[PDB]
Amino acid sequence: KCSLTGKWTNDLGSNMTIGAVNSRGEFTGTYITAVTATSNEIKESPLHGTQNTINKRTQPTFGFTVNWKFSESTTVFTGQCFIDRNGKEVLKTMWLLRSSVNDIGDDWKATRVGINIFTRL
Amino acid sequence: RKCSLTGKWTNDLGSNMTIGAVNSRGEFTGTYITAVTATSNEIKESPLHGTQNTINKRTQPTFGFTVNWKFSESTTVFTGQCFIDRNGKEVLKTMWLLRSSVNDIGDDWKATRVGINIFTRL
Amino acid sequence: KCSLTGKWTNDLGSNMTIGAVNSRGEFTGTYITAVTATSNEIKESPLHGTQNTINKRTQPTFGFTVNWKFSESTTVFTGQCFIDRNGKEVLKTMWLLRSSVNDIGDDWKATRVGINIFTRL
Amino acid sequence: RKCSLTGKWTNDLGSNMTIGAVNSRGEFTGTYITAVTATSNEIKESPLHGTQNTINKRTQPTFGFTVNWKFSESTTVFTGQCFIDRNGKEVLKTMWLLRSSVNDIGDDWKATRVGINIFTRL
């Protein structure tokens, strides 16, 4: 089975570590991003999420939220934990990066989208 | 005035969710009761877990959460901001990604749907 | 049938006019946005797109590109032309707003996403 | 050095596209030959139409286009930027929305998929 537990790196140079996944699918971790949309100094940030455990898939879906500690933003990631053709694990994910806006009239411009592919560190 | 995630919410598709207390680290848990599904499965209350961003203790914080669906193999994530709207109402403006399970990594490209949800207090 | 031709307004206060849709599904129009992510002065911008004509649906899908004339950005919209429960036409759309970045290393942050609902003006 | 959309491109999913000349208004037409589909229909060459942004005559312009699929009722839009990569190669970095047709406006929420494509010259 593909398991989220462990250390990962992505295509932008960010790393994350995820701890034990419990019987309800819950996990916590830490994220160190290589990139930011702000001109703020990056700091390591917690993440929390779940793996879907329905039918106990060898390649489960999952999602997590990175609670950025150096900005007012939040990012969520979701994807699937695959075994690729080489037998290596790969997380294929898409994310939404939510920026803080001061006024609800600017809400429309607050959400960026993209992908990340993670492999084991 | 502050916008708080804790409590009961309903959305523009008829779904409800309950969010519990937000701890000092911004963490919260809740339950999601969806009105709609992409599958032909029975909907069932599913847990959610997420965080509110506490940097600068904003009155209108950003947040994100994951719904761990219990009636399908999918996962949805939501992120958005807890606003005080012009009328003084608390409103969650969110966008989501719904990740379906695929069997072959070759089909990964078609596995993610996107959309919005707007939540107000029940 | 729901037809894209005509004048529309959206939930953010933007308007657009779309001309005749030809037999291949092609149309052109003009977009006047009520909002921008830049601090530039908005100007009316051309759009070009297509309606899908397969099976000649009464509620077709469609897409179009707004070629912004007051910024370096581009937005694309896609959605479906519905008749709602009142018999009114509504365009339900989602969009990607692509900003220009100077360097490919910043590509990850260049795409915003959102929705717009259009009704007839 | 300029990145130009005109010519033949291939993507990370195996799809190809041909883009014709870009006129003074930034307009172009082309053909898309997709390797993948969300339906169980036969893929068939489909037309595309879009624009390149010409403001400030950037060497690495943004652009967008719509693929008018001819073998399904769906539409896809792409937007991105025509870059000169660090190795001097022209690369289209794009994101897309794939809109499926639904019969009932009530199902609109599940009709839009999202993803990326990276194109290089064939």
Curated annotation (Swiss-Prot), chains A, C:
Q: Does the keyword Signal apply?
A: yes
| Annotated compartments | Secreted
GO-annotated biological processes: antibacterial humoral response
Sites carrying a glycan are N15
Give the family per the record: Belongs to the avidin/streptavidin family.
Taxonomic superkingdom: Eukaryota
Q: Which residues form the Avidin-like domain?
A: 1-121
Q: What is this protein called?
A: Avidin
Which controlled-vocabulary keywords does the entry list? Biotin, Disulfide bond, Glycoprotein, Secreted, Signal
Task: Return the GO cellular component terms, semicolon-separated.
Answer: extracellular region
This protein's gene is called: AVD
Q: Which residues of the full protein are shown?
A: 27 to 147 of 152
Q: What does this protein do?
A: The biological function of avidin is not known. Forms a strong non-covalent specific complex with biotin (one molecule of biotin per subunit of avidin).
Q: Describe how it is modified after translation.
A: N-linked glycan at Asn-15 consists of GlcNAc(beta1-2)Man(alpha1-3)[GlcNAc(beta1-4)][Man(alpha1-?)Man(alpha1-6)] Man(beta1-4)GlcNAc(beta1-4)GlcNAc.
UniProt source species? Gallus gallus (Chicken)
Q: Quaternary arrangement and interactors, per the entry?
A: Homotetramer.
